[PDB]
Design an enzyme around this catalytic site. Structure first.
Site, PDB file in Angstrom:
ATOM      1  N   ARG A   1       0.806  -1.237   0.000  1.00 51.53           N
ATOM      2  CA  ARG A   1       0.000   0.000   0.000  1.00 51.53           C
ATOM      3  C   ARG A   1       0.834   1.280   0.000  1.00 51.53           C
ATOM      4  NH1 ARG A   1      -5.346  -0.137   1.923  1.00 51.53           N
ATOM      5  NH2 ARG A   1      -5.042   2.102   1.536  1.00 51.53           N
TER       6      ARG A   1
ATOM      7  N   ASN B   1      -6.121  -7.905  -1.314  1.00 42.34           N
ATOM      8  CA  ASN B   1      -5.649  -8.412  -0.020  1.00 42.34           C
ATOM      9  C   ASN B   1      -6.377  -9.719   0.321  1.00 42.34           C
ATOM     10  OD1 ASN B   1      -8.005  -6.452   0.367  1.00 42.34           O
ATOM     11  ND2 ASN B   1      -7.899  -7.229   2.445  1.00 42.34           N
TER      12      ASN B   1
END
Length: 98
Positions: free
Chosen positions: A23, A41
């Site tokens: 991220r 994810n």
């Protein structure tokens, strides 16, 4: 379609037991590269998702992600498989976890 050199490629970062802080790094630099898509994810840190970009930019993106710079942890092994040329950038930048 394929006639357009805009390639939707899928990646997988092998984050065996999570930890992989992909991220921001992704988002910001992918924007700079000139690419669009997202991060997926999972349960066990296999940070997958979609990279759509014009040809030259996706090449740069592939050179990157293996080029592993950090906001916390090591991006432990990124494989680039599932390569399909499409048309247009069907997302609001390279974004977040989905």
């Amino acid at each position: 379609s394929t006639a357009r050199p805009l390639k939707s490629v899928d990646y997988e970062v092998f984050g065996r037991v999570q930890g992989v802080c992909f991220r921001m790094y992704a988002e910001d630099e992918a924007r700079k590269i000139g690419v669009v898509g997202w991060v997926k994810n999972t349960s066990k840190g296999t940070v997958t998702g979609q990279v759509q970009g014009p040809e030259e930019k996706v090449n740069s993106m592939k050179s990157w992600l293996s080029k592993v710079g950090s906001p916390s942890s090591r991006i432990d092994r990124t494989n680039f498989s599932n390569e399909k040329t499409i048309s247009k950038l069907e997302y609001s930048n390279f974004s977040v976890r989905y």
